[PDB]
Amino acid sequence: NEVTKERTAQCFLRVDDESMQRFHNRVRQILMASGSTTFTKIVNKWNTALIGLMTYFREAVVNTQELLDLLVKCENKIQTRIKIGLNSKMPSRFPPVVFYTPKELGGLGMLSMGHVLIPQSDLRWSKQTDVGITHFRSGMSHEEDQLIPNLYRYIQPWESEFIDSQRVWAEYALKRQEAIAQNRRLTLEDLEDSWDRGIPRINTLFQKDRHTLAYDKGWRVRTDFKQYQVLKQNPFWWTHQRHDGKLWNLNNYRTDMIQALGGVEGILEHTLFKGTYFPTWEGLFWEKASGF
């Protein structure tokens, strides 16, 4: 309550059944339209759908156990489709490093909203030096088999989002009102701690086209109605990256996914990288398409 400032009510959230049906339909049409389609395109479509669902319905997944089951089922569907694409026979002990490797390291970079364990035997690599060939494991920790980080923990809940947004906007208002008097523009220096916090993300204040965007009105309604003009459904039908900013950061998720897989060294041990005899992994780049 805004007067008693007490916990007068409790709000339980859930993902609507229509939204779950729409997500399942989107995954089904992703999969069935994959007879002649690259694996990376399929994984990117799945990743886009998953981030749209999880960012839109954060705090509402946890209470919808049916949604968790549907999510893991669809992720298994995607993995099965990719595995069938590789070979026309189901692998028995397929490893997760192929799917959950970031695309720059050659992997598919699929986002996992589930629970996938990496077998310990897949966290060992070997390196040849002048003395001989030495073997390395990934972690000194004596725990269960490594679990890839779950996207669940890498999205801040809406309640925290709104509280943080209110605090950040109050701080920004105070800074602006105390900087008008001394006559200095906010120069990105004091607005560094509160960088990706407010719902109209502070990055939008410093956006390049921040003047021409101010005359763009009714953009949420236009984004929602865009489904009647473009042949492709938009997972982010509700927000605009330019107007609203980026509401989710995958830097930490991908950081911990690289960390969990044993790092670049182990991931490349799973690959042909050492078979290329490249002295290091730093000064290298990919090429998406060949000349022909």
Binding site: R58, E59, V62, Q65, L68, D69, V72, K73, E75, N76, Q79, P91, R93, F94, P95, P96, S112, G114, H115, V116, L117, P119, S121, D145, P149, N150, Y152, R153, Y154, I155, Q156, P157, S160, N249, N252, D256
Partner: peptide, 22 residues
């Protein structure tokens, strides 16, 4: 070690959503 994705229903309730993020 099967390579299949497991459903995290009834799992990892000791962790929040705002954790492991700065």
């Amino acid at each position: 070690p099967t390579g299949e994705v497991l459903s995290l229903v009834g799992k990892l309730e000791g962790t929040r959503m705002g954790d492991k993020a700065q």
